[PDB]
Swiss-Prot record, chain A:
<dbReference type="GO" id="GO:0005829">
    <property type="term" value="C:cytosol"/>
</dbReference>
<keyword id="KW-1017">Isopeptide bond</keyword>
<dbReference type="GO" id="GO:0003735">
    <property type="term" value="F:structural constituent of ribosome"/>
</dbReference>
<keyword id="KW-0963">Cytoplasm</keyword>
<comment type="subunit">
    <text>Component of the large ribosomal subunit (LSU). Mature yeast ribosomes consist of a small (40S) and a large (60S) subunit. The 40S small subunit contains 1 molecule of ribosomal RNA (18S rRNA) and 33 different proteins (encoded by 57 genes). The large 60S subunit contains 3 rRNA molecules (25S, 5.8S and 5S rRNA) and 46 different proteins (encoded by 81 genes). uL23 is associated with the polypeptide exit tunnel.</text>
</comment>
UniProtKB/Swiss-Prot annotation, chain C:
<dbReference type="GO" id="GO:0002181">
    <property type="term" value="P:cytoplasmic translation"/>
</dbReference>
<dbReference type="InterPro" id="IPR000054">
    <property type="entry name" value="Ribosomal_eL31"/>
</dbReference>
<dbReference type="InterPro" id="IPR023621">
    <property type="entry name" value="Ribosomal_eL31_dom_sf"/>
</dbReference>
<comment type="subunit">
    <text>Component of the large ribosomal subunit (LSU). Mature yeast ribosomes consist of a small (40S) and a large (60S) subunit. The 40S small subunit contains 1 molecule of ribosomal RNA (18S rRNA) and 33 different proteins (encoded by 57 genes). The large 60S subunit contains 3 rRNA molecules (25S, 5.8S and 5S rRNA) and 46 different proteins (encoded by 81 genes).</text>
</comment>
<dbReference type="GO" id="GO:0022625">
    <property type="term" value="C:cytosolic large ribosomal subunit"/>
</dbReference>
Curated annotation (Swiss-Prot), chain D:
<feature type="compositionally biased region" description="Basic residues">
    <location>
        <begin position="6"/>
        <end position="19"/>
    </location>
</feature>
<dbReference type="InterPro" id="IPR000077">
    <property type="entry name" value="Ribosomal_eL39"/>
</dbReference>
<protein>
    <recommendedName>
        <fullName>Large ribosomal subunit protein eL39</fullName>
    </recommendedName>
</protein>
<comment type="subunit">
    <text>Component of the large ribosomal subunit (LSU). Mature yeast ribosomes consist of a small (40S) and a large (60S) subunit. The 40S small subunit contains 1 molecule of ribosomal RNA (18S rRNA) and 33 different proteins (encoded by 57 genes). The large 60S subunit contains 3 rRNA molecules (25S, 5.8S and 5S rRNA) and 46 different proteins (encoded by 81 genes). eL39 interacts with YIH1.</text>
</comment>
<keyword id="KW-0963">Cytoplasm</keyword>
From Swiss-Prot, chain F:
<comment type="similarity">
    <text>Belongs to the TRAFAC class OBG-HflX-like GTPase superfamily. OBG GTPase family. NOG subfamily.</text>
</comment>
<comment type="function">
    <text>Involved in the biogenesis of the 60S ribosomal subunit.</text>
</comment>
<protein>
    <recommendedName>
        <fullName>Nucleolar GTP-binding protein 1</fullName>
    </recommendedName>
</protein>
<feature type="modified residue" description="Phosphoserine">
    <location>
        <position position="15"/>
    </location>
</feature>
<comment type="subunit">
    <text>Associated with nucleolar and cytoplasmic pre-60S particles. Directly interacts with RLP24.</text>
</comment>
Amino acid sequence: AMKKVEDGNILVFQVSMKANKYQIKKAVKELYEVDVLKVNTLVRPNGTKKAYVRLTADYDALDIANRIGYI
Amino acid sequence: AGVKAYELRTKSKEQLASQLVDLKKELAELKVQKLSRPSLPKIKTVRKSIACVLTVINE
Amino acid sequence: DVVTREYTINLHKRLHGVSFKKRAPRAVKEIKKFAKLHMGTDDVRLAPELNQAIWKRGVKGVEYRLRLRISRKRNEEEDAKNPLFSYVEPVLVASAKGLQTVVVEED
Amino acid sequence: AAQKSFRIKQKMAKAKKQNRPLPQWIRLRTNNTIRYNAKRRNWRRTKMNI
Amino acid sequence: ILQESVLNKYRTAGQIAQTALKYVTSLINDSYHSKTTQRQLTVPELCLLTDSFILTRLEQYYKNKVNERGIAIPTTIDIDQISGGWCPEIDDTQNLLNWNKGKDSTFASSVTGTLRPGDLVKITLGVHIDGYTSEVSHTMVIYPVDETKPILQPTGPLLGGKADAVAAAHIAMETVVALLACALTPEKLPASLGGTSSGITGQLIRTIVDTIARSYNCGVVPGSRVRRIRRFLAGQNEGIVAEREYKGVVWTESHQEADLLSNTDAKDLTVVDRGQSTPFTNVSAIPSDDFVVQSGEVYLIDLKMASLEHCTKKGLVTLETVDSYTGKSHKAGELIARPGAYVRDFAQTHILKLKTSRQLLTKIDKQGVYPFKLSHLSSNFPFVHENEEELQSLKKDLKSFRLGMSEISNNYLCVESPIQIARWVPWDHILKATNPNGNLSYDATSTLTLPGHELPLPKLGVSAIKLKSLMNSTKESISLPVARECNTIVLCDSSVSTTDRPELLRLTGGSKTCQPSWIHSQHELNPQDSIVQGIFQLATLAKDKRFGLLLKETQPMKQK
Amino acid sequence: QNRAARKNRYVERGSDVVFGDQDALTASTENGVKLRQTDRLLDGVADGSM
RNA sequence: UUCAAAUGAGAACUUUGAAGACUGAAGUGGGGAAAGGUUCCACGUCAACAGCAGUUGGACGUGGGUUAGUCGAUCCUAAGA
C-alpha cells in the first residue's frame, strides 16, 4: 500500500461492505475536498472490503496522508 | 469522564449535531491511529459518548 | 607427517561380480577403503574431480585402471578425532600400465 | 472454484477468521477451565462441507 | 603533530559551538527579551535556521583536508519537564496542536513554541568533526522587562525555586570542572579530600555533588555523565548503542539510596539482597573504584539537576517516556509528541521495498553514525538566501522523506529516540507496592536496553515496567523541571604548549559563553560545619594562580 | 597487481570502527516475530515473566 | 544415485555447487473445468505428524496478498419447474 501510494499517487482505504463506488467518491470528496480520477474496490478474504482511489495531477496523496495521522 | 445525558440534553439540534459530527471525526482519527498499537482504552468513552448523543437526539 | 605418495588403483580387483545398478557407489566405497588400508587414518575425503572421472565413463561402465594420489593433512583445531586426515585427488595418464607408486616431494 | 457466491465466500471468510489457536493471556485469569480450543480445524483433516 | 591536530580540531569544534550558542542566545533575547521588536518566532524555525547557520560555518573548515564532518547533536531548544531530544518541526505545529487539543493547560506554549515568560528554556548542541564530537548545554530565563529605563535590565536579580536549582547546577558545574582540572602535575588538591595521596576517582565527585544537591535542596535527575571520549564514541547514543570500554561514572536512581547505616527507617523489612546475576550487558557497570585521570585524551562532563517543589517527604525522581498516540489517558499535564531524532543500527543489513526508502537509506548511510533529524537531510539545506520558496520546497521534500522514514520504522532499520519527563514518586508507594516478580524480560520494545543495562532497581527487585506503572498510578505525581548543562575538557602537555605547563582547556564553557541569569537568593551552601570544604575549594580554585593558572577557555568568532 | 591498491584503504570506513562488532543483532533477534504489526499472542501479555 | 562446501549440538535425505540420471510435448510442463477454501507467500520456530531420521515441509506461531463500461454471472430461451 505504501509503495503504491508513493509511486502511483493512489490512496488505499478500508470501506464498509455496504458502501459502493459512488458512496466512496462522495465520502472522499466531502471529507477531503479532493478530486478523484478513479475508484476501485475489492473485498479481502478477511471479511471487509478495501478500496483504491486515484486522484488528479493537481493533488498529491502525501499531504493528506501526513495530515490524517498515519505515515 | 465522558458526557452525561442529564446535562447533555439541555441543547438544541444544531449545535448538538455539529458536536456529534466533530466527535465522529475524532473517532475516525482515533481509528486511523490505533493501527499500530493493539490496546487503546480511550475508545470506550468515545463509543459511549456517541451512543449517548445519538440516543438523546432520537428521544 | 604430511606426505604425498601417488598410488595406482584398478577397479576390476574389487568391482568384479557386483550389481550393475551400484557400480559407481561400489567403486566409491572400495576407493575410500583402499585409501584407509594404505594410509592408516580415520577421516578420508574424496575429490570432485575424481567423482567426475569415475562417473564420466558411465554409471555401469567405470574404467578399470585409474590413477589417484593421496595427501595427508593435519586436521584443524577442535578436531576431537586426530590430526590425521586423508584427501584424494585424481590425475590422468596417457597409458594405464607402466606406472607404479611414486612418492612426490612437497614443493 | 473462483466462482463461489457471496454467501459462500462470506462463510469461508468467517471460517478463516475463526481458524486460530487460543490467545495466551486467557490462561492468566482466575478459576479458568479453558485448556485448548476444540473448535480449531484444518483443511487437511476436517471438511466443513460449506 | 597528533597533539597539534587534536587540539586544533577540538578548539575549532568548541569555538564553533560557543559561537553558535552565543548567537542563539542573542537571537532569542532580541526576539523575546530586551527590545520588543514584535519579531517573536517559535522554536522549530529557530532550530532549523540555527542548524543551517552551523552547517554554513562548518562548510568552510576541513572541506578538503578530510571527508568527515557533521552536527553531533541537533540544536535542542527544550522547555521545562523535557529531559532532552525534543526538536519540533515546522510542518508539525498543526499536527501537535491537533493532538494536544485534548488538554493544553500547562504546556500549550511549550508545544506551540511561543514560550511564556519564566519558562526556563534550555539549549543543547553538538558538533562532529572527523569522528570527534563536542557538546554544549545551558539555560535561560526570561520575564517582563522594565520600561522606565531604556537600558532594559529587568529588576536585576530574579527569584524562584527553579532559579535556585539552576544556580545549584551552575555551582556544581564549576566545582566539578575545578576538581577535574586538579588532576594534572599540580597534584596538590585544593581540599582535605587528598592532595598528597589520592587517585582522584569518582567517589570524591559523588560526595561533592551529593553535598551540593543537599545544600541547595534540589535533587539530581539520573542523567549525569562524566565520561572520557574516544573517537567515534561519545555517549551521544545514551543507552541505545552499547558501550564497553567506557571508564566513567553515571548517576542512577539505584545510586544515592539509603545505606545500611543511614539513620533512616527506609522500611528495610529484611528484603533479601539481589544475588541474581544482572542481564548480560557489555558494560563495565559503574567501575566506581578506578577513575584515575590520564593525559592524551578528552572528557565530557554533563550535569542535570532536578528541582524539588513542595513535597511532604523524600521520594524518588525518575524518567518517564512519552508516546505520540493520545490513546493512553487524559491528564491536566499530559504531553503528546512525536520524537524526531533517529539512528540506524548498522549491525542489521536488510533491503526495503520503496525507491524513496532506498534513496534515503543510502543518504543516511553517507551521513555519519549519530542522531539526526529528518530536516537535517536537504539538497537545499544551506539556505544561501532567506525566503519561502526554499522553505516550501524543503517541506515538499520532507513529506516524501517522512514517508520513507515511516517505512524504515515499520521495518527493523532504526531506533526511536526516547523523550523523557522527570517525574517524582514517593518511596512509600514503591515500598508498599505489589512486586509479583523479580525480573521483567519484556522482550517487546524496539530493541536493546531491555533492563536499562543495569536493573532499574536491583535493591527491592523492582522492574522498569512496574516502576512506571506505579508512577502513573499515583495521586501527587509532582512534575520537576530539570536544569542541564554540559562541557568538554581537554588535557594538555608541555609538548602541546611549550610556553607553559600541561594545562587544561575548557570547551563550550567559560563565563563568556555561560553567563548565568541574574539570580540572587538564600539557602546556598550554608556556612560552618564540615560543608566548608566546597567554599574552600572554590576560593582555592580562584586563587590557585601565583600570577597565571593552567586553565584556558575558548572564545567565539565574529560572523565575518 | 599494484593497480588493486584502491579498495585497500576502503576497508577502513570508521564510524565506531563499523559500529563496534555485531551487538544490536543479538537483542533485535529476540523477538518472536518481526515487523510492526499487532500480535494477538505477544501483545496479549506484557510482562516477560508472565 | 555420487562427491564437495555451507548452516547446524548433531547430515544417506536441508541449501548451493560439481556429476549422473529419468519424465520424452496423448509429459512428472504450461492453463483450467467440478471440487477443494487460505493450503499461495514472507518471517521465527520442530514436543505433536510426514511408518526412518529430519537443521526441511502441503506441519507449528504471526502477518501480507485477488483492483473489470470490454473477462464470466447478472440479459434471452430449450428439454422442464
